[PDB]
Design an enzyme around this catalytic site. Structure first.
Site, mmCIF file in Angstrom:
data_model
loop_
_atom_site.group_PDB
_atom_site.id
_atom_site.type_symbol
_atom_site.label_atom_id
_atom_site.label_comp_id
_atom_site.label_asym_id
_atom_site.label_seq_id
_atom_site.Cartn_x
_atom_site.Cartn_y
_atom_site.Cartn_z
ATOM 1 N N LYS A 248 1.055 6.819 14.884
ATOM 2 C CA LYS A 248 0.564 7.952 14.116
ATOM 3 C C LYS A 248 1.142 9.207 14.755
ATOM 4 O O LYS A 248 1.041 9.393 15.965
ATOM 5 C CB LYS A 248 -0.979 7.978 14.176
ATOM 6 C CG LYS A 248 -1.683 9.234 13.611
ATOM 7 C CD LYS A 248 -3.216 9.113 13.844
ATOM 8 C CE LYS A 248 -4.079 10.141 13.089
ATOM 9 N NZ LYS A 248 -5.554 9.976 13.400
ATOM 10 N N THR A 249 1.789 10.042 13.962
ATOM 11 C CA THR A 249 2.337 11.282 14.495
ATOM 12 C C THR A 249 1.850 12.473 13.651
ATOM 13 O O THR A 249 1.156 12.298 12.651
ATOM 14 C CB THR A 249 3.884 11.303 14.447
ATOM 15 O OG1 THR A 249 4.303 11.236 13.079
ATOM 16 C CG2 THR A 249 4.474 10.143 15.237
ATOM 17 N N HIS B 92 5.131 0.138 7.858
ATOM 18 C CA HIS B 92 5.301 1.097 8.943
ATOM 19 C C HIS B 92 4.970 0.372 10.275
ATOM 20 O O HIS B 92 4.766 -0.877 10.314
ATOM 21 C CB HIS B 92 4.417 2.333 8.696
ATOM 22 C CG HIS B 92 2.965 2.012 8.552
ATOM 23 N ND1 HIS B 92 2.214 1.499 9.583
ATOM 24 C CD2 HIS B 92 2.119 2.148 7.503
ATOM 25 C CE1 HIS B 92 0.968 1.336 9.181
ATOM 26 N NE2 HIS B 92 0.883 1.728 7.924
ATOM 27 N N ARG C 72 -10.111 2.182 -0.827
ATOM 28 C CA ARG C 72 -8.678 2.476 -0.858
ATOM 29 C C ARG C 72 -8.276 2.922 -2.269
ATOM 30 O O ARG C 72 -8.880 2.520 -3.271
ATOM 31 C CB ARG C 72 -7.839 1.270 -0.496
ATOM 32 C CG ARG C 72 -8.359 0.476 0.670
ATOM 33 C CD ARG C 72 -7.398 -0.648 0.994
ATOM 34 N NE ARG C 72 -6.290 -0.112 1.757
ATOM 35 C CZ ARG C 72 -5.999 -0.506 2.982
ATOM 36 N NH1 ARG C 72 -6.752 -1.438 3.532
ATOM 37 N NH2 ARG C 72 -4.981 0.034 3.648
ATOM 38 N N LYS D 19 -4.176 7.226 18.283
ATOM 39 C CA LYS D 19 -3.762 6.148 17.401
ATOM 40 C C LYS D 19 -2.253 5.828 17.456
ATOM 41 O O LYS D 19 -1.384 6.691 17.263
ATOM 42 C CB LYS D 19 -4.217 6.456 15.962
ATOM 43 C CG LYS D 19 -4.127 5.237 15.023
ATOM 44 C CD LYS D 19 -4.259 5.634 13.536
ATOM 45 C CE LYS D 19 -3.721 4.535 12.611
ATOM 46 N NZ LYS D 19 -4.255 3.195 12.991
ATOM 47 N N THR E 11 0.838 -1.191 0.000
ATOM 48 C CA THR E 11 0.000 0.000 0.000
ATOM 49 C C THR E 11 0.886 1.259 0.000
ATOM 50 O O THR E 11 0.407 2.397 -0.086
ATOM 51 C CB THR E 11 -0.922 -0.025 1.250
ATOM 52 O OG1 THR E 11 -1.751 1.144 1.259
ATOM 53 C CG2 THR E 11 -0.101 -0.064 2.486
ATOM 54 N N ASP F 12 -7.663 -6.660 12.118
ATOM 55 C CA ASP F 12 -8.746 -6.520 11.177
ATOM 56 C C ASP F 12 -8.832 -7.666 10.172
ATOM 57 O O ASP F 12 -9.659 -7.626 9.269
ATOM 58 C CB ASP F 12 -8.580 -5.198 10.413
ATOM 59 C CG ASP F 12 -7.232 -5.093 9.665
ATOM 60 O OD1 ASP F 12 -6.349 -5.927 9.872
ATOM 61 O OD2 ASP F 12 -7.053 -4.145 8.864
ATOM 62 N N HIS G 226 2.496 -2.485 10.851
ATOM 63 C CA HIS G 226 2.743 -3.853 10.371
ATOM 64 C C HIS G 226 3.748 -4.576 11.266
ATOM 65 O O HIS G 226 3.947 -5.759 11.105
ATOM 66 C CB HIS G 226 3.300 -3.817 8.921
ATOM 67 C CG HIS G 226 2.481 -2.974 7.986
ATOM 68 N ND1 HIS G 226 2.892 -1.733 7.535
ATOM 69 C CD2 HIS G 226 1.254 -3.185 7.443
ATOM 70 C CE1 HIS G 226 1.954 -1.216 6.756
ATOM 71 N NE2 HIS G 226 0.947 -2.077 6.684
ATOM 72 N N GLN H 96 -7.808 -13.224 -0.820
ATOM 73 C CA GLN H 96 -7.007 -13.653 0.316
ATOM 74 C C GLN H 96 -7.462 -15.080 0.777
ATOM 75 O O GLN H 96 -6.665 -15.834 1.271
ATOM 76 C CB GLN H 96 -7.093 -12.666 1.492
ATOM 77 C CG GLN H 96 -6.357 -13.172 2.774
ATOM 78 C CD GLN H 96 -6.067 -12.020 3.752
ATOM 79 O OE1 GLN H 96 -6.113 -10.832 3.362
ATOM 80 N NE2 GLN H 96 -5.724 -12.356 5.004
ATOM 81 N N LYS I 16 -12.253 -0.622 7.162
ATOM 82 C CA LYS I 16 -11.813 0.672 6.637
ATOM 83 C C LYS I 16 -13.085 1.462 6.322
ATOM 84 O O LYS I 16 -14.085 0.869 5.907
ATOM 85 C CB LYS I 16 -10.975 0.498 5.396
ATOM 86 C CG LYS I 16 -9.478 0.777 5.631
ATOM 87 C CD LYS I 16 -8.715 -0.391 6.237
ATOM 88 C CE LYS I 16 -8.937 -1.725 5.378
ATOM 89 N NZ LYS I 16 -8.080 -2.983 5.615
HETATM 90 N N1 LIG Z 1 -5.055 -8.351 3.923
HETATM 91 C C1 LIG Z 1 -3.799 -8.384 4.722
HETATM 92 C C2 LIG Z 1 -2.560 -8.589 3.810
HETATM 93 C C3 LIG Z 1 -2.580 -9.961 3.139
HETATM 94 C C4 LIG Z 1 -2.955 -10.099 1.787
HETATM 95 C C5 LIG Z 1 -3.070 -11.387 1.205
HETATM 96 C C6 LIG Z 1 -2.787 -12.519 2.005
HETATM 97 O O1 LIG Z 1 -2.855 -13.771 1.471
HETATM 98 C C7 LIG Z 1 -2.412 -12.397 3.328
HETATM 99 I I1 LIG Z 1 -1.907 -14.073 4.438
HETATM 100 C C8 LIG Z 1 -2.313 -11.141 3.897
HETATM 101 C C9 LIG Z 1 -3.690 -7.024 5.415
HETATM 102 O O2 LIG Z 1 -4.251 -6.055 4.884
HETATM 103 O O3 LIG Z 1 -3.046 -7.004 6.450
#
Ligand SMILES: N[C@@H](Cc1ccc(O)c(I)c1)C(=O)O
Ligand SMILES: N[C@@H](Cc1ccc(O)c(I)c1)C(=O)O
Lengths: 322, 322
Positions: free
Chosen positions: A238-239, A48, A89, A235, A43, A200, A51, A179, A85
């Site tokens: 976040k700054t 960051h 996006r 959050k 993204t 999420d 993650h 996914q 969300k």
């Molecule tokens: N949707 C997840 C990122 C992601 C995407 C595909 C996938 O197969 C897997 I395991 C994880 C996120 O946004 O954190």
């Protein structure tokens, strides 16, 4: 029926938000090393702090003897995960996501061991299978296993369908299938039987467990780490200046180090558990020590040192002092 | 602002169920000949009576000087139209649908003129563009223009989402996007500005009008013919023996002819309007004539002769008497 205590150990760190069949997962883990996966969507040209907990959690599994598969979403990043969300996006171009994919892969690598035993890490990219998959094949071979009735009451997208000020494109509504198929595909080619993800990600993960069951009759598992919160309610990560990036060229190791020094007393001990490899024993002793010293808390300094080293190595730590 | 009376003439036959902006459509038709489309999905190796009114309606447009595009769903027949259907349609194999596509195309051809003026018919197959379209392209380039919130309250699928005893796969839920894109594509390559379809096609058609607007900024139109009903309430074109096919090898011209002879007095005059090219004037005179003759009604015999010839030609009509 041996039972692994790895899930318990992570629970103790406050690192397990939800887990599917914890009893059966714990027994499976005690049977021997497994292949597990954690994934990241391109993204941006860097991950960051949002993650980091899942990423380190993948490393905690590897350290426990399991095999981590680090997936980067070359195809899912062209679609966009709507999970919890508020709005659609941004769609990025194929050329930009491809470049970001490479950047993220290279950034993730140093966190895992790609050259050790049988538990060496594996880098994966779902563009490998979706990049050239034709639409009719997708709709039929994957699509027939998904009930729209079930998809719309998934918590992750429910709000986008119920609030008026919040619609969802068919594009993002399809993300859950992509996914979900990733989990089936990884189970098929690498024997992945556990998917871990951010807070999420529950619905995306369970869609993968169900589709793996439907397509291959294999029981697989999922676990999510918690949404990291601050006692003051703002959050995390976040700054004023935006996100705190893992890329030294975007957020300097000096600035990264300062972010951790700035941790509130109310959050610091919890953060040592989420972000470091110090034992629970040591973190509790450190908390007790700060409680009785009459000195500034040593915890922020310890946290800053540990995470800065984890993320930017000894060189970053040294650059944090100049 | 000249105004065409073609829609009025069809209304008089009871052949217009719904029409988008009838005033603007009628003005467009008076501007000159247009390209219009009617489509059929290869759900069997032949069309049957449920497809006849729309098919003849495409011919009525051609006879009025417009250009008919007869689309056969090589790709949509691999997906399945859920519109006003209670349950999931059977998925057929690619090899079988391809063979059915050919059969239907050849069966449709004789009904239209492919060699006359500038209004010669055009055969189309949406497999041309979906057959090799990759999934990410579909989800992004087409998918971003569809709101799931809007899709779920489409009348055609609402019941599948609201009743419990009636779910819908993501496969069939996506069908509306495929047919909506077909309209945009046909408008782009052939200048098609009007789509006609069966009674259950309103939502698919309007999705095409909207997407054509969104993608090409061209205003296009749609019209549906009515669900053909019988005064006794039973299902039209349904017999103990199943469907009444347009294929002579599946339903003999003799048996086809007998089906029309068997028409109820209450339905026959309406059926002359839906299924033949006799003028409204002549059909009314025929009804008046049967009303005052003291003889068996001549209408069933006229209907049987006319439709049997339309569908199986002079040879079929002759075979209907031996
Ligand atoms: N949707 C997840 C990122 C992601 C995407 C595909 C996938 O197969 C897997 I395991 C994880 C996120 O946004 O954190
Ligand atoms: N869904 C239609 C058949 C059909 C399919 C695709 C398309 O572009 C068109 I125009 C018509 C039906 O079931 O009657």
């Amino acid at each position: 029926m041996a039972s692994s205590n790895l899930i318990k150990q992570l629970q103790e760190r406050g690192l397990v938000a939800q887990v599917t069949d914890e009893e059966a997962l714990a027994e499976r883990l005690a049977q021997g090393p497994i292949a597990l996966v954690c994934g990241f969507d391109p993204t941006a040209d860097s991950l960051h702090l949002g993650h980091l907990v899942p990423l380190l959690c993948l490393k905690r599994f590897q350290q426990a003897g399991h095999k981590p598969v680090a997936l980067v979403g070359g195809a899912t990043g062209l679609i966009g995960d709507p999970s919890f969300k508020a709005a659609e996006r941004k769609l990025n171009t194929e050329e930009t996501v491809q470049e970001w994919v490479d950047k993220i892969r290279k950034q993730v690598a140093p966190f895992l061991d790609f050259d050790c035993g049988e538990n060496s890490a594996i880098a994966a990219n779902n563009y490998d299978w979706f990049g050239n998959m034709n639409v009719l094949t997708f709709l039929r071979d994957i699509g027939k296993h998904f009930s729209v009735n079930q998809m719309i009451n998934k918590e992750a997208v429910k709000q986008r369908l119920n609030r008026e000020d919040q619609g969802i494109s068919f594009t993002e509504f399809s993300y859950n299938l992509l996914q979900g198929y990733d989990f089936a595909c990884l189970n098929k080619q690498y024997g992945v039987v556990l998917c871990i993800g951010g807070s999420d990600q529950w619905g995306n993960i369970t869609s993968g467990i169900d589709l793996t069951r439907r397509l291959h009759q294999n029981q697989v598992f999922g676990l999510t780490v918690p949404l990291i919160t601050k006692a003051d309610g703002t959050k995390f990560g976040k700054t004023e200046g935006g996100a705190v990036w893992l890329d030294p060229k975007k957020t300097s190791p000096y600035k990264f180090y300062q972010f951790w020094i700035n941790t509130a007393d109310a959050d610091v001990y919890r953060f040592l558990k989420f972000f470091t490899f110090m034992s629970i024993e040591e973190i509790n002793a450190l908390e007790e020590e700060d409680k009785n010293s009459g000195k500034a808390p040593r915890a922020q300094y310890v946290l800053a040192e540990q995470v800065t080293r984890l993320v930017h190595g000894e060189e970053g730590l040294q650059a944090a002092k100049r």
